[PDB]
Amino acid sequence: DVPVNLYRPNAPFIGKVISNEPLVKEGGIGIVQHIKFDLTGGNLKYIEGQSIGIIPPGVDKNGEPEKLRLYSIASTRHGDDVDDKTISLCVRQLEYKHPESGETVYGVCSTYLTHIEPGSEVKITGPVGKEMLLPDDPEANVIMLATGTGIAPMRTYLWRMFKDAERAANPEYQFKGFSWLVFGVPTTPNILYKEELEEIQQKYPDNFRLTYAISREQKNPQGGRMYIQDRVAEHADQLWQLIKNQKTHTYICGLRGMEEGIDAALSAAAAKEGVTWSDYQKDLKKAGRWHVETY
Numbered sequence: 001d002v003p004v005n006l007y008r009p010n011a012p013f014i015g016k017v018i019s020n021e022p023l024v025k026e027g028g029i030g031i032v033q034h035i036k037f038d039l040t041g042g043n044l045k046y047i048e049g050q051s052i053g054i055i056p057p058g059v060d061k062n063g064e065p066e067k068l069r070l071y072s073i074a075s076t077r078h079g080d081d082v083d084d085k086t087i088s089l090c091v092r093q094l095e096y097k098h099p100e101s102g103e104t105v106y107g108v109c110s111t112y113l114t115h116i117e118p119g120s121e122v123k124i125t126g127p128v129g130k131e132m133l134l135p136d137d138p139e140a141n142v143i144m145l146a147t148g149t150g151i152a153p154m155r156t157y158l159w160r161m162f163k164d165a166e167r168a169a170n171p172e173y174q175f176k177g178f179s180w181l182v183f184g185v186p187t188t189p190n191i192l193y194k195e196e197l198e199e200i201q202q203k204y205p206d207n208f209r210l211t212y213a214i215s216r217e218q219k220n221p222q223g224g225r226m227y228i229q230d231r232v233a234e235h236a237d238q239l240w241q242l243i244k245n246q247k248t249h250t251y252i253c254g255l256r257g258m259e260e261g262i263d264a265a266l267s268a269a270a271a272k273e274g275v276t277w278s279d280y281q282k283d284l285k286k287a288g289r290w291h292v293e294t295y
């Protein structure tokens with residue numbers, strides 16, 4: 001049932017950019033773009049929580065053709081316009097140090113994508129991934145722990161759950177469980193999809209909780225910048241109590257480095273009831289209820 005590898009890098013789907021729109025507001029750190037691609041003319045189908053590959057143009061420093069980079073699909077299966085014709089990505093421009101004055105390095109594929117024009121043709125592969133799939137059970141609980149562009153799979157879940165047009169398009173999935181997004185970004189301008197996440201919470205105050213960790217605007221109890229692991233620690237007992245439910249699924253997505261703190265917080269919660277979290281978590285992973293995609 002799950003679509004996988006309908007296109008492969010030896011013969012990718014050539015899609016066209018429909019739109020490329022900024023998600024970081026003025027005063028935010030960095031560049032994150034919402035990029036929508038036209039899928040008409042091919043048969044690329046996908047579901048929520050999957051990824052696609054993008055093959056950037058050009059050669060690397062060794063004169064070899066650039067390989068695909070993976071990006072989490074940011075739209076539901078129907079695409080943003082609920083027409084089954086498009087796919088969207090949430091792409092941050094990678095840029096970093098190499099310790100010289102002004103000398104910034106820009107990532108190949110992410111710079112290509114964040115600056116791409118509508119009408120441009122792009123090499124797309126996939127979809128891939130079966131580790132971040134959403135349960136069909138409408139009564140499932142869904143905990144979402146995201147930093148930065150790790151919001152992307154979370155958006156596909158929340159849009160399927162809560163967008164009016166999605167609910168109209170998916171008679172079989174009328175979500176009535178509880179979902180909780182804890183979302184970590186450096187600033188309020190950097191809150192990707194802020195308006196829509198908050199509109200969802202206002203519509204569905206009993207089915208959706210939104211928690212932010214904004215590092216440059218908030219401090220944890222120890223005086224440090226507020227990160228997602230601090231919010232998990234702050235709510236560790238509630239999160240553990242939700243996780244004990246047989247129908248609760250947890251999803252963790254974003255750049256690597258978040259998991260150690262999340263585990264330490266949940267380990268302290270579970271230990272209060274004589275449970276060793278690492279063991280409970282192993283069984284949760286085996287059961288398909290602990291989902292991680294960090295990069």
Ligand SMILES: Cc1cc2nc3c(=O)[nH]c(=O)nc-3n(C[C@H](O)[C@H](O)[C@H](O)COP(=O)(O)OP(=O)(O)OC[C@H]3O[C@@H](n4cnc5c(N)ncnc54)[C@H](O)[C@@H]3O)c2cc1C
Nearest residue numbers: 069070071072090091092094096107108109110149152295
């Ligand atoms: C499953 C999956 C899903 C992903 N989803 C998304 C998504 O939704 N959105 C998104 O923006 N990205 C996503 N990523 C990451 C994405 O695939 C690319 O790795 C990223 O966009 C950078 O690619 P690039 O071509 O821009 O960089 P490259 O040009 O390959 O640059 C990256 C290389 O430079 C180095 N480098 C990177 N950062 C630093 C640093 N701080 N200091 C020193 N050296 C460094 C490393 O050698 C790294 O291999 C995902 C990755 C995976 C594996």
